[PDB]
Design a protein around this ligand. Structure first.
Ligand SMILES: C[C@H](CCC(=O)O)C(=O)O
Ligand SMILES: C[C@H](CCC(=O)O)C(=O)O
Ligand SMILES: [Zn+2]
Ligand SMILES: [Zn+2]
Ligand SMILES: [Zn+2]
Ligand SMILES: [Zn+2]
Lengths: 334, 327
């Protein structure tokens, strides 16, 4: 019959309003303060807003209703930008706290207790002076965790336990980062069902993925359209996007389904509409690869899996119900 | 004719007593806006900075140069608020310091030049406040990116006439490599201040640079961990040389004929998030005078050593005016 609230950049929404949800996206992958200090890098702020609003309208027309922007502070998350484009496009956006790959000195020097207070601040009080409350915590490793990355993982688990909001991660999938991340989260008493091990489609190792899924972890197959096939002459695009086909990444979805782990899958594009933390031309290159942007999951991956025999009701469970269970906050500890 | 401040243009004569290397708040890009509770509160930091700038003004300071860059967390709206409430001019900086984010580290020399020019000619962020100085940094031998920054800083200075000021590892003689790269871009040494030079006692390093026309920034005079020997983190940052030892370098350079190329400052700050958590309280406990330390302590110390008042006015008033006035 019933087919609690999630915080978005426009306020609370019910779990039913979330609908088709892309769990790992970015409006703009940047650096803290950068969009405000140098909007001309993106053409203009107004150009970036219009480009993002068109992109979100394209995804909405394909059925997307919510995206989770997993841009942290140090990824240059600007929640006022997310709020504006969410209003104009009528697509819900969940904002993130946490820390990504590029913390500044003022973060890198902090204690696990201090990082915990920062993450709690952005969840419980709001981000900057906007009142917008984060609905997920993003963390990152790139191989074995640095000492600071450990602190971030522990502060994230402690913030998650105190607030009920879930944790999503960036991995070097080929290095099986998810195993160490899981070990640290579990040492903090975090439930695996509140953790998504992200960028897991970057690897073909199914024994690694199914082992985490069997432990209750969510498996983020979140970069399906990332591929430099056809751009072999472009070293920067090839290093970023990899030489594995979108079809190859997509078949991991079906492989997890066939092995019984449908309930552990999350799917996304890991797209963006501006991109300043890499080489200068990279957004233009990615847009030439995938004009559909965030609409790639519903317009290309769903019809692909449907013809391989995956039932629509299974795909709806992965893209609607699974994110809903992920993002719905659990009870606060104590 | 005019110098750009966070309140707008001023004439050269309005600058008066000027501290050439200071910080309202040493932080990181976006950090003050995202986590102001680190400093108690934004209002508390404002209040602390206004009280400190008002004391410096009562001691005779009329202008400070805030050499906080984008990546040092410069918030020009904070600078504008505290300058207005303390009636002390503040000159804002562009350039890049020792903590550039990916979106900066990945940029070309041409792109960096455009960014520095924007903050000088157009304004910082959406405030309309234009930078009046370019800040650069090395910590020993320059990284490849730091070489780009020095070159972009030189090109921006040439296009606008605003001067360049540097962070050095003085005991590795960084000013020499900085001078080499600047001169390879055609930049005039008289447009360059080699900063943190009071961090070394090697006077021959300093005088060779000055004999080439450079300005020498003796800018951390009150930095000292004397009495804090059981504090490893303060000792590493502040050093174990006394403020008297740093101040004697001012007299030494005067005695060697370089009084017209000395720039003096405190390198102080009212908030400090880019180091260990307690560091601002520790620094305040050893120098409560803050930015008023130069006029309240260093001026009387030098006058007792026999430096005449006209020499001290030339260093604190005439030199900064000549340096900041765009060419
Ligand atoms: C598009 C994505 C944004 C950053 C991230 O997901 O780590 C990428 O660069 O891989
Ligand atoms: C006090 C000074 C502020 C930053 C700078 O001058 O490099 C420091 O942290 O060394
Ligand atoms: Zn990532
Ligand atoms: Zn991402
Ligand atoms: Zn410095
Ligand atoms: Zn400084």
């Amino acid at each position: 019959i019933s087919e609690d609230r999630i915080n978005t950049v426009r306020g609370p929404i019910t779990i039913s309003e979330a609908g088709f949800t892309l769990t790992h996206e970015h409006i703009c992958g940047s650096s803290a303060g950068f969009l405000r200090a140098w909007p001309e890098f993106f053409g203009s702020r107004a150009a970036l807003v219009e480009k993002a609003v068109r992109g979100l309208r394209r995804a909405r027309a394909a059925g997307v209703r919510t995206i989770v922007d997993v841009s942290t502070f140090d990824a240059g998350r600007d929640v006022s930008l997310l709020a504006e484009v969410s209003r104009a496009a009528d697509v819900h956006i969940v904002a993130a706290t946490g820390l990504w790959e590029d913390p500044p000195l003022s973060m890198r020097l902090r204690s696990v207790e201090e990082l915990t207070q920062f993450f709690l601040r952005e969840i419980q009080y709001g981000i900057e002076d906007t009142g917008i409350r984060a609905g997920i915590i993003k963390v990152a490793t790139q191989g074995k965790a640095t000492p600071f990355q450990e602190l971030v993982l522990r502060a994230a688990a402690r913030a998650s336990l105190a607030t009920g909001v879930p944790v999503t991660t960036h991995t070097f999938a080929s290095q099986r980062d998810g195993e160490q991340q899981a070990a640290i989260f579990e040492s903090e008493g975090l439930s695996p069902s509140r953790v998504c091990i992200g960028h897991s489609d970057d690897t073909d190792d199914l024994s690694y993925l199914t082992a985490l899924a069997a432990r209750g972890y969510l498996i983020g197959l979140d970069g399906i359209p990332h591929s430099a096939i056809g751009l072999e002459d472009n070293a920067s695009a090839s290093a970023l996007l990899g030489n594995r086909s979108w079809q190859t990444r997509a078949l991991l979805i079906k492989a997890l389904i066939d092995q019984g782990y449908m309930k552990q899958i999350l799917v996304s594009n890991d797209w963006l509409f501006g991109f300043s933390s890499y080489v200068t031309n990279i957004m233009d290159v990615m847009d030439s690869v995938n004009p559909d942007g965030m609409a790639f999951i519903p317009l290309r991956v769903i019809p692909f899996l449907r013809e391989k025999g995956v039932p629509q009701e299974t795909l709806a469970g992965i893209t609607v119900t699974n994110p809903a269970r992920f993002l719905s906050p659990t009870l606060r500890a104590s």
